[PDB]
Design an enzyme around this catalytic site. Structure first.
Site, PDB file in Angstrom:
ATOM      1  N   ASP A   1       9.403  48.072 -98.831  1.00 42.23           N
ATOM      2  CA  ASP A   1       8.380  49.525 -99.022  1.00 42.23           C
ATOM      3  C   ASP A   1       8.001  48.824-100.867  1.00 42.23           C
ATOM      4  OD1 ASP A   1       7.367  51.681 -99.777  1.00 42.23           O
ATOM      5  OD2 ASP A   1       9.179  53.217 -99.715  1.00 42.23           O
TER       6      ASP A   1
ATOM      7  N   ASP B   1       1.036  49.526-101.671  1.00 40.46           N
ATOM      8  CA  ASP B   1       1.778  50.055-101.246  1.00 40.46           C
ATOM      9  C   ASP B   1       2.322  49.626 -99.970  1.00 40.46           C
ATOM     10  OD1 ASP B   1       5.031  51.795-100.606  1.00 40.46           O
ATOM     11  OD2 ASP B   1       3.317  53.824-100.730  1.00 40.46           O
TER      12      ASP B   1
END
Lengths: 329, 323
Positions: free
Chosen positions: B33, B208
């Site tokens: 992440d 992201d």
């Protein structure tokens, strides 16, 4: 048998809310009324969290009839987790002010994302009292005890759809809301309003299932395993990672749901568990039948079922009652 | 010369890979992440509904566990711990979070097939000021550049990869194009945007890997969607349109020197097909700082991405369709 009603506002057939007040200055809040839980709770002025950032917060500072208590408490649901503290003040529902002991919530972090997505502030419990020192009598029982209604009874009427209001009527059963005769069933345990049933859903049966009749669930819910079998060959598609079940609105394979009590039979046709969701090129519906794993064989009869059946909750005789809701008032 | 963790794709919403902690080398499923900066594993002393089907880290069993206990905490909580992490058979001393409470991951921690999250952001995004895993590894001489890349398979039938230590030929076509970070925090970048009729000058764009969608602030998004024949489901972050909806415009993102696009076919995921073909749109509303948009998995499926600490850039190239 004179009733008293809070108007219920219907948002997209998924949640019904009404208004009640707390404090002598009568601070207004929006509530779900939940037959599944026992307390009244509201978000407190001193609830910090992101969720509380949009809600109506109850301010004790401004109520001349507030009375501190301060006992920390944490109650849980399917929904699921919430925390804060007991406070006494005067609560007003439909038109009846009474002194009550409720929870100011200061922590709503296991109420997400149910809470943030919703347009309610708190929840009025219409469930059964806990055996604990000193849990509160539920609002309807208290009302009876204070001699403000003559019967500890409340009913729900939910309109078929968006353009009409719904009704939680307290203290009397009004003819205007249904046709034919109430039918009544016996409860099996007294945590909540739970009824014993035989279910027939398409090919699927379960003998001796127990159904929670719950006003604050927007679906019929059933164990995962069994719902998994329910949907097969029905041409229903689950959206990954979402509790969402889509199918064509006129799907002819979708069965009428039967629930059998000891003497009685209630059915639920597709139209009461389907909500049009999209309409370009076809009519696409969500089915309001979702998997929730609770106790063995436990099902919840939420809004879709009550949109067909006006339902009476009688604390006094320990029964739930059912009859066909009127199509127009 | 990279090391890659295989990402498995579930339904195109999330990709998870395996990593290890401790000498008894316990395994876990992680979201990798770029929009965070800590490693979070569930703790053996996690109780919550969610934790009860996970792989829970048990310091007691790992002889190289070193106790920290610093309380950490919008709405996920635990304590710090030290131990050796292995990712892609690269092994390192690390300070992670043992999570004891899971409610902030839980609009779907329970629904997802992951145990934890390995953050791939910048130290200043970290709680507890932890050098990022890739920085460690470069300092420690264990890899060759503080650089990592993501290849995301454009469907279920293929593995994705997080490759650490090198930019590999196999993942892309053409030239790489680089944008400098406006801040060392997220992998964030200035782009001029053009969504149909809406333009926005010098928006900031967070690249992201842990988001499954493009995000835009709310008002802007609801305006983008007007007259596009896109409908929202009451009460969920879901937007449905007909799959060959001809009115859907290609997203456009511009820097000083480059241009990137994202056609409908990249931001639409098919969802229904009985009679007509229906799609979910992978653009959803999220309100961060004023002109901040997230470029999630939908974008990264078109564009192979390179994240470079050394040169404070992100690079982009068209991902190979076939490896």
């Amino acid at each position: 048998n004179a009733g008293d009603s809070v108007t219920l506002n219907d948002v997209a057939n998924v949640m019904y809310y009404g208004e009640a007040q707390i404090g002598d200055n009568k601070q207004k809040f929006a509530f779900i009324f939940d037959t599944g839980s026992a307390n009244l709770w509201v978000p407190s002025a001193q609830c910090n969290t992101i969720g509380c950032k949009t809600k109506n917060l109850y301010d004790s500072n401004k109520s001349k009839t507030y009375e501190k208590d301060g006992t920390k408490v944490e109650m849980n649901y399917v929904s699921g987790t919430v925390s804060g503290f007991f406070s006494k003040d005067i609560v007003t529902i439909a038109n009846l002010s009474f002194p009550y002991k409720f929870i100011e919530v200061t922590d709503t972090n296991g109420f997400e994302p149910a809470y943030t997505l919703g347009q309610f502030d708190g929840i009025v419990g219409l469930g059964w009292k806990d055996l604990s020192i000193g849990s509160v009598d539920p609002v309807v029982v208290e009302l009876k005890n204070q001699n403000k209604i003559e019967q500890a009874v409340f009913t729900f009427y939910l309109p078929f759809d968006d353009k009409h209001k719904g009704y939680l009527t307290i203290g009397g059963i009004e003819d205007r809301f249904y046709e034919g005769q109430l039918t009544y069933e016996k409860l099996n345990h007294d945590l909540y309003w739970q009824v014993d049933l035989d279910l027939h859903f398409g090919n699927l049966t379960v003998e001796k299932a127990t159904a929670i009749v719950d006003s604050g669930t927007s679906s019929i819910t059933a164990p995962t395993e069994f719902l998994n079998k329910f949907f097969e060959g029905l041409d229903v598609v689950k959206i990954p990672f979402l509790p969402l079940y889509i199918t064509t609105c006129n799907n002819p394979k979708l069965p009428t749901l039967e629930f059998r009590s000891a003497t009685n039979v209630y059915t639920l046709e597709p139209e009461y568990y389907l909500q049009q969701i999209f309409d370009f090129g076809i009519s696409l519906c969500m089915v309001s039948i979702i998997p929730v794993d609770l106790n063995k064989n436990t099902f919840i009869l939420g809004d879709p079922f009550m949109r067909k059946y006006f339902t009476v909750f009688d604390y006094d005789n320990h029964t739930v009652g059912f009859a066909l809701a009127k199509k127009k008032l």
